[PDB]
Design a protein around this nucleic acid. Structure first.
Lengths: 76, 79
RNA sequence: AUUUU
């Protein structure tokens, strides 16, 4: 699948929130919030390149709570 | 969208399992595990909502009769 | 535990 990196999750962020945000865009096979409390970021894996691109183009810049998310294809 | 009923979840099932099971089939907008309010245990069933009829049907056909833990899932469109 | 907690 295609790995998506999401920055600016809040300290209380949970996997639930990622599923709820990305699920509506296409097939999602995995989500993970990175923790030490959340470290501020997490990942989602989507099967279909086009749907991943949609989720990314749609959710980058989204205000979650009162923080501005950064969403993009994961880099190495 | 299209509401899917799932029976034979375990007592400690949580939303996470419904996402993992139905997520790979297409757009899922919502999941819900039904619990007994007074024990907080799962009553054995849950609901998932999928946007696209064909993808919901594919999820239903692939998961119905499939094993989760020691149990056989029953998956169908909600009545 | 069979169709909303």
């Amino acid at each position: 699948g295609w790995c998506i990196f999401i920055y600016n999750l809040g300290q209380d962020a949970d996997e639930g929130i990622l599923w709820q945000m990305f699920g509506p865009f296409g097939a999602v096979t995995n989500v993970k919030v990175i923790r030490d409390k959340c470290k501020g970021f997490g990942f989602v894996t989507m099967t279909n390149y086009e749907e991943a691109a949609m989720a990314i183009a749609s959710l980058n810049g989204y205000r979650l709570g009162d923080k501005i998310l950064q969403v993009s294809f994961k880099t190495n």
